[model samples]
Target: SLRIAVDAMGGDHAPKAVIDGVIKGIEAFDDLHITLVGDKTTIESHLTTTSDRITVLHADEVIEPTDEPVRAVRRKKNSSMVLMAQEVAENRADACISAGNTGALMTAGLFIVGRIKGIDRPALAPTLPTVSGDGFLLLDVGANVDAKPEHLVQYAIMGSVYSQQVRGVTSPRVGLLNVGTEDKKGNELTKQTFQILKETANINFIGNVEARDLLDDVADVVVTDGFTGNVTLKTLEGSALSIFKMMRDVMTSTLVLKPKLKEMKMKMEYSNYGGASLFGLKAPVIKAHGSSDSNAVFRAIRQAREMVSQNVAALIQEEVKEEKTDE
Candidate 1:
C-alpha cells in the first residue's frame, strides 16, 4: 500500500476539509493509507470513525502562510509541513501533501526530504488544460523565477520524465518558451536556454516556442524561468476567462451544447487537474490552494498516489544521474 503524509491543518478549511478529503481518498483508493499530521484532538473531532487506513500524527505547530519559509522550516521542526516531509524522508511515507505555505513546503521539502542528487532546485509545475485534452506541462510557475540557463535545461529534463512517467506521454516534446520561433528571437535567458536545449540529445528538444502557440499541441512540456512562466500562466488564464465571457455573450445572442460548454468550463477548473507539483524532490510534494475544499484535497491526494506509484521521482533521478555524456 502507498503511504502518504497529509498536512491536515494547513489550508483555509483546515481540519474539516482536509480530513473529509482524506476520508474520500482512502475510500476511493484501495491500496492507500494516510497520516493526518496536525493537532490530533481537533482532527479527530472532525472525523467520525474515519477508517483504519487513516492515522493521526500529533503536530502542535502549524506554519503560517506568512511565516518566513527558511526560518519556519528550521524553527518549527514540529510544524505540520516539516513533520510531513520528515516522515517521508524517514521512509514512513512515500510522499507528502499540503495546502499550506507554498514557500515553507518547498523549504521543508528541500531541507528535510532533500533533492534528487543532481537537481540544483525543484520546480513548481501545473498542467495547463487545452481543448485537445492534451495539456502541456509548464514549470517554474511559482517556485524560482530567477533561473539560469542550466536550471532551464534541468527543468526540461524534469518535465520530460514527469510528462512521460506520471502523465504517461511517450517521448514528450520539450520546447523553450520564447518571444518568437526564430533561432535568435529571445532575450539572453531564452536564447541561452534555447542554445543548450537544442544540443541536449537526451530530451526531444523542439526549438523556440511562442506563448501564443502553446495550446495548439505545440509541445508536451514547456520550460521557462518562473517569472516568465507565471506571467504566461496568468495571461493564459485571463484570456480563457475573457474568451468564456465573450462566449457567454454570444450564446445569449444565440446558442447548442450549452451543457457541454459548462462541462468545458468546469474541466478547466484548477482543482480538476489538481495542484501544482513541487518537482525534483526526493519524494512527491504536492501543494493545493489555500482555499481548496474537500474535493480539491481529494484530487491532490490522487496526484500524490499517481506520483508515488508511477515512481516519478525515481525516474527523474535515473534521468538526471545518467549524465547525458554517454559511456
Candidate 2:
C-alpha cells in the first residue's frame, strides 16, 4: 500500500472537500492509504465512516492563501501543510499532496522534505491538455522565479524522465520554450540553455518550441525558466477562460452550438488533468489547485499514486547521479 500525506485544511474547500476526496480515493484504489493532517475534530466530522486506511494527524494551524509563504512555513511549524511534508520526510508517507498555498508547499518541500541530491533546483511540472489526446508536460512553472541556464537543462532532464515514467511516453521529445524555433532566437538564458540541452545525450532535444505551437503536439516535454514558464501558463489559462466565456455568450444565442461547446468546456476544465508535480524533490509533492473540489482532489490523489508507483523521484535521482558521474 502507498502511504500518502494530505493537507486536509489547506484548500479553499478545506476539511470537507479534502476528506471527501480522500474517501473517494480510498474507495477507488485498494492499495491507497492516506494520513490526513488537519484539525482532528473537523476532519472526523466530515467523515461518514472510519477506516484503517485513513489516519488523522492533528494539526492546530492552517496556512491560509493570504499568508506569506516562506514566513508561514517558518513560523507555523505545526501547520497542516508543514506537518504533511514532515510525514513524507519521516518516511511515513510515500508522497504529499496539498491544495494549499503554492509557495508554502514549495517552501515546505524544500525545507522539510528536501531536494534530491544533484538536482540544482526543483520544478513545478504540470501536464497540459493538448489538441491530441496525449497531453504535454510543462516544467519550472513558478518554482524558481530566477533560474540559470544550467537550471533549465536540469528541468529538461527531469521533465523527460517524468513524461516517460509517469505519463508513459517513450523517448519523449524535449523542447525549450523560446520566442522562436531558430537556434539563434530567445534571450541570453534560453540561447545558452538551448546549447546545453542540444548536447544532452540522454534526452531527445527537439530544438526551440514557440508558445503558439505548444498545443499542436510539438513536443512531449516543454522546458523553460520559472519566470517565463509561469507567465506562459497564466497566459494560456487566461486565454482559455476568456475564450470559454465568449463561447458561452455565443452558445446562448445559438441553441445548436450548445452541446458542442459544452463538450469543449469539459475538455478544457483544469480539474480533469489533476495537479502539478513538484519535481526534483526527494519525495513526490503534488500541488492541487487551491480552489479544488472533491473531483480535483480525487484526480490529484490518483496522480500522486501514479507518481509513487513509477518511482519518479528515485528515477530522477539515479539519472542525475549518473550525469554527475559521467561529467
Candidate 3:
C-alpha cells in the first residue's frame, strides 16, 4: 500500500474540506492509506467516515498563508505542513500534500523534505491544460522570482523530466517563454537562455513560446523565470474565468447549451489538474490550491500517488546530473 501524508489544516476550508477529500481519496484508491496531520480533534470531527487506512498525527500549529515562508518553516516545527513533510523524509509516507501557503510549502519541501542532489533549486511545475488536449507543464511558476539563465535551462530539463516521466510524453518539447516567438525577440535573459536551450539538451527544444500562444500547446514543457511565469499563469486563469462568465450570459438558451457551456468551463477548471509539484524534491511534495475543495484535494492526492509509483525523483536523479555534460 502507498502511504500519503496530508496537511489537514492547510486549505481555506481547513480540516473539513481536507478530511472530506482524504476520505474520497481513500475510497477511490484501494491501495492508498493516509496520515492526516493537524489538531487531532478538529481533524477527527470532520472525518465523517471511518477506515483503518486513515490515521491522524497531532500537529500543534498551523501555517497561515500570510506567514513568511522560510521563517515560518523554521519556527513552526509542529505545523501541519511541516509534520506532513516529515512523514516523507522519515520514510513513513511515500508522499505528502498541502493546500496551504505556496511559498511556505516550497520552503518545507526544500529544507525538510530536501532536494535531489545537483537540482540547484526546486521548481514549481504545474501541468496546465492547453487547447491541444495534451496539457503542457509550466515551471518556476512563482518559485524563483529572479531566475538565472542557467536556472531557466535547468527548469527546461526538470520540466521535461516531469512531462515525459509522469505525464508519459515522449521526448517532451522544451520551449523558453519569451516576449515573442521569433529568435532573439526577448530580453537578454531569454535570448541567452534560448541559445543554451538550442544547444545543450536531452530534451526536444522547440525554440521560444509567446504568452499569447501559451494555451495553444506550442510546447510540451515551457520554461521561464518565476515572476513572468506566475504572471502568465494568473493571466491565463483569470482570462479563462472571464470568458466563462461572458459565455454563461450568452449561453442561457437551452438545456443543451447549459450542459455544453458548463462542460467547457469544467475543462478549464484548475481543480481537475490536482496540485502543482514542487519539482526537484527528494520525495513527492504536492501543493494544492489554497481554496481547494474536496475534488481538488482528492485529485492532488491522486497526483502524489502517481509520482511515488513512477519513482519520478529517482528518475530525475539519474538523468538530471548527466544531461548538461554534453547535451
Best by lDDT: 2
Candidate 2's TM-score: 0.96
- Pick the winner on TM-score between candidates 1 and 2: 2
lDDT per residue for candidate 3 within 1-327, as digits (tens), equals 799999988888877889888899888999999999999888778866689999889999988989999999999999998999899999999899998888999998888888888788878888888775688888988778887788787788878878887889998998888878888889888898988887764779889887788778889999988888898889998998897778667756752565875776677776678879988888889989888988889889989998888888887776667545355
lDDT of 2 by residue, 165-226 (tens): 97889999999999988998999999999998877887889999999988789999999988
The digit string of per-residue lDDT tens for model 1 on 1-327 reads 899999998989878999989999988999998999999888889989857899889999999989999999999999899889999999999988999998898888878888887898889998887767788899888788789998898899989988998788999999989888898888898888888787777789888888888878899999999899889988988888899888789878855476876787876765677888989888888888777899999988998899988888877877775467122
Q: By TM-score, is 2 or 3 better?
A: 2
Model 2, residue 21: C-alpha shift (Å)? 1.2
TM-score for each of the candidates = 0.91, 0.96, 0.94
Question: Candidate 3 regions off by >4 Å?
Answer: 249-256, 323-327
Better of 1 and 3 by TM-score: 3
The lDDT per prediction is 0.87, 0.88, 0.85
Clashes of each: 0, 0, 0
Model 2 scores worst on lDDT over the 10 consecutive residues at: 318-327
Better of 1 and 2 by lDDT: 2
